[PDB]
């Protein structure tokens, strides 16, 4: 049980939570801060 | 506990250790 819950916590870094992509560097290298922030925030609210 | 084995594990405590049983590195990163 304790090795299955923690594996989902890593599987869930592959979901973009409705953002442009699921890799933070992608978003940082495709968008300026004014529009980058509004996507990072739907990542930061998805992982937390 | 037996004198022969280096540790003080008894003949039934060892039958339990040898019965209960990359990605862990990724978790570490």
């Amino acid at each position: 049980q304790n090795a299955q819950a923690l594996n989902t916590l890593v599987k869930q870094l592959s979901s973009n939570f409705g953002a442009i992509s699921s890799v933070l560097n992608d978003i940082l290298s495709r968008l300026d801060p004014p529009e980058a922030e509004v996507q990072i925030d739907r990542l930061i609210t998805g992982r937390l | 506990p037996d004198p022969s084995k280096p540790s003080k594990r008894s003949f039934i405590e060892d039958l339990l250790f040898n019965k209960v049983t990359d990605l862990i590195c990724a978790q570490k990163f």
Binding site: V10, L13, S14, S29, R30, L31, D32, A36 | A26, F29
Partner: protein, 469 residues
Amino acid sequence: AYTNSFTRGVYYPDKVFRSSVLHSTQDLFLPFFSNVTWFHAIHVGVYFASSNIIRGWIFGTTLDSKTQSLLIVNNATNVVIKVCFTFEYVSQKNLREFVFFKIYSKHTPDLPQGFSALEVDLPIGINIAYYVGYLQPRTFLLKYNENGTITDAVDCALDPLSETKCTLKSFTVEKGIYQTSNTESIVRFPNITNLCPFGEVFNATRFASVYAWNRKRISNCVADYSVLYNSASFSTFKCYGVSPTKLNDLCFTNVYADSFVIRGDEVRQIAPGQTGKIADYNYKLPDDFTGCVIAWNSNNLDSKGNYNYLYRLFRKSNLKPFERDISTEIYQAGSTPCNGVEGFNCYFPLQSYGFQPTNGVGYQPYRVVVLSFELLHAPATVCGPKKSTNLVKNKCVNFNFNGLTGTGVLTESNKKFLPFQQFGRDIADTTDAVRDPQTLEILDITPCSFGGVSVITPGTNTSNQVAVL
């Protein structure tokens, strides 16, 4: 003439009152336990602190009167600030601080342990006894008293005790263990040497009609669009997948150049999700679009009147995304199948533009070129102007391989890629193994933060000695 800073420093940061609060402020302060350069020599963010002989001070990027200089001078109760010995600012042992365009104020009367607390914003708009000091970005947790006076503050990077105190927002840490938390640049772009047909797709003497919009692939170009805004004046440019500023930092897997000529009052219809006789019967843009749209006036050339341009007007079905349709079967709006007769309730599909030099703005021809592409996929051909450095071979780097950024140590790889295979993604869909865009070799990325520090400590009351783990 180095000397050790003891307790001086901290200044009232902001204009908001606070009393009996252990506030934490992230600003540049004077370090504790730092080197002041005491100067007594009488027989060129920064800090400053000092019979009032020194008055002012001068700076600039080069200071040769070719660029902007800056002179600030104080007096008994007066100052003069200029760009010279375009702005004319004029106003009304011992440490009278002249603290640093951001200058500070509030002087107050080696150095003992007293813990003083210090505090006009002077605009420039340009590029830039007797003690000294410096400021660097280092967190400080201030202890506002019951009357508003800063009675205590803690450096937040000085000692392990300081980090634990910051973590707990407290001045007294008890016995135990606390779990506090714990390079160069590489740019690699492909070996493309030639530009792209800027002067072939943007200034062609004739563009196609809308209903039969031309199409052209571009490949193996290092497109420096800066050379473009010298000749033409673009009346519209709105990129829809990527922010415009970063257009010279990535690589674009495939690129297309759709070109046509619409009227002025239709250029707004080239956008994802709109309607009109351009977005329904001629050229439909997909909803998940990624690309840029360019449009400028062309009444100088495409005008006589000019009847060489057509557009589809009648149809019973809307176009799907990117769906060219060329046909001349006349439209049937009624009942009978009109076989070529432009008669009642049955008309020709295509009509023309009456482009004319006398047409009001909005009826003038507007050349349009859209550039669709796709970002950060595996194979990339067209890229940005920026150059390429050399590999560092096992040092931590902020690499920029073929568009994508990323931090880590670039160790050597042994990943048995396919000759077709480029990028290795990990279990968490985070890239870790890459193919060099020039040497065609394989590199492995190891991010390095290496966390997990802890601070074994007896009670801070009991002692100060601490042990790190």
